[PDB]
Structure formats: C-alpha cells, structure tokens
Design a protein around this nucleic acid. Structure first.
Length: 42
RNA sequence: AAACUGAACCAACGGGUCCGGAGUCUUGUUUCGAGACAUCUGCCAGAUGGGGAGUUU
C-alpha cells in the first residue's frame, strides 16, 4: 500500500499557479546596469 | 465558442546532493507604436498680436 503518486501541476495559460520564472531579461535593472548595457549597444 | 458567481499557493514525481519536472540560446534594447520625421532641443529670422505694458490725445 504505497500511496506515493505523481500529481503534476500542468501549468497552462489559465490553469495553475506557475512556478517562479527567471525574470532577469524583463526585470527593471538599476539605472547604471541598463545604462552600461545600452552603451554597448550603441 | 453565447453567457447565466465552486476550488487552485508554500511540488508531487522521475533520473544520476545535483539535473529534470518547468526546452535551450542572446551581435545585449522592459514591451508596444511612430522614427530620422516633428508636437523633440537650442539659437537666429519674419508674420500675427489691446491678451498685456508705457505714454500721449
């Protein structure tokens, strides 16, 4: 009687609370960080 | 897929404490629209201008 059972969250657009995602790209960085990147882009 | 008020968190689990579950990558913007334009910025130039100033009559 082993009741260990997988119960996957199955994240979908409307379904379950997702796991935390890495927001690094869309994050708001401090003023000097976005600035020392953009200066490279130029 | 006309609609007519339910619930969802703090991982279950799988693989060899890590990696999955939850694709990886970055010549780099937070994303979208416009864009070398103008309602952008500064100076120079004209027109208008009793809205306002001075004075005369």
């Amino acid at each position: 009687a082993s009741h260990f059972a997988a119960r996957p969250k199955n994240f979908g657009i409307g379904q379950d609370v997702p796991y935390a995602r890495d927001l690094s790209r869309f994050m708001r960085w401090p003023t000097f960080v976005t600035m020392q990147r953009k200066k490279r882009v130029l």
